[PDB]
Amino acid sequence: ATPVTIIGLGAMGTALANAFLDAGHSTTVWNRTAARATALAARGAHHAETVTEAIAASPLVIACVLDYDAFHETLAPATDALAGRALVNLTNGTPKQARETASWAADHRIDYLDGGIMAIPPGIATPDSFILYSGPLGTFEAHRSTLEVLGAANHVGTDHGLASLHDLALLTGMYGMFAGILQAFALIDSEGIPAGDLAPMLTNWLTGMAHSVAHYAQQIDTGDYETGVVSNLAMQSAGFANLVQAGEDQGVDVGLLRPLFELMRHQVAAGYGNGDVASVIELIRREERR
């Protein structure tokens, strides 16, 4: 079993360390706040006093801290200790930060993968969990068996920015859903109905309507927003006007959905009402792709 070092013992990093300990790896851990390592150390983890001690302990170093600023602040002084090792950054960040970190790593003989954890901490090391990786295939395949302790391992390309691009796209979908869920519960709440009374029906509706994804992708990829439309944009915008009006009638703030509402009305007025709602992507995608 490959020895592994975890840098960062928040909710996610603690889950990673526990998963490697469960799988029998010699697991070295470090956290800015040392007290977050105490339970892990009692469990058999090697609690390093410094970042450099932690890094020197293992051929594979996994970083999972709050953000890029934390990642940079923590590892920049330890550049020399990372020489010759594999660094897997599971800290959330942008494609730009991943490509800049990759340039730094190539300048200092650090093998580098950028990754995005598509799981919550209790999901780590369960069939729910998968993690996206980008960077050199040699580094990915060398550590794939170790990484698969955490969940499925999906290498999405050699361009180091690609795992974060996919990560952030998935989070983007998720947060739109979350906004919808909050606003849906706010509307039902406005008549004194518990959220739990709506939750089963809402779960089923969102599950079923989550198959719009492939349909929407096909419309976008072909540029055809008109063929086979059964829910036209003019009708959808009329219904959207009513859920906005109903929220206002019931004293609910509907600001979260106003941007989409306004875009859909704009598109109806521009003549696209007989097509599907996905045509709105033409108003937000980057100019060179329109």
Ligand X SMILES: NC(=O)c1ccc[n+]([C@@H]2O[C@H](COP(=O)([O-])OP(=O)(O)OC[C@H]3O[C@@H](n4cnc5c(N)ncnc54)[C@H](OP(=O)(O)O)[C@@H]3O)[C@@H](O)[C@H]2O)c1
Q: Which of 7, 139, 147, 27 has its CA nearest to residue 77?
A: 7
| β strands within the chain, DSSP E | 4-7, 27-30, 46-47, 60-63, 86-89, 111-118, 130-134, 152-155
Among 207, 230, 251, 271, binds ligand X (CB under 6 A): 230
Write out the binding residues for a copy of itself, residues 61-120 only, by CB under 8 A. 66-68, 92-97, 118, 120
Among 182, 226, 227, 269, binds a copy of itself (CB under 8 A): 182
Among 5, 92, 139, 164, binds ligand X (CB under 6 A): 92
User: Starting from the edge strand earliest in sequence, which strands make up the sheet with 152-155, in order?
Assistant: 46-47, 27-30, 4-7, 60-63, 86-89, 111-118, 130-134, 152-155
Q: Which does 136 bind (CB under 5 to 8 A by kind): ligand X, a copy of itself, none?
A: none
73 binds ligand X (CB under 6 A): yes
If the CB atoms of residues 53 and 189 are measured against ligand X, the closer one turns out to be 53
Among 43, 109, 144, 258, binds a copy of itself (CB under 8 A): 258
Q: Which does 192 bind (CB under 5 to 8 A by kind): a copy of itself, ligand X, none?
A: a copy of itself
Q: How far apart (Å, rounded) are the C-alpha atoms in residues 61 and 87?
A: 5
Per-residue x/- track, 106-145, ligand X (CB under 6 A): -----------x--xx------------------------
Q: How far is CA 83 from CA 125, 139, 257, 263, 279, in A?
A: 29, 14, 49, 51, 49
8 Å CB contact between 16 and 62: yes
Residue with tokens 């079993």: 1
Among 5, 18, 91, 267, binds ligand X (CB under 6 A): 91
Q: Which does 73 bind (CB under 5 to 8 A by kind): ligand X, a copy of itself, none?
A: ligand X
If the CB atoms of residues 104 and 185 are measured against a copy of itself, the closer one turns out to be 185
If the CB atoms of residues 116 and 135 are measured against ligand X, the closer one turns out to be 116
User: Which tokens belong to 167?
Assistant: 């990560």
Eight-state DSSP code of residue 5: E
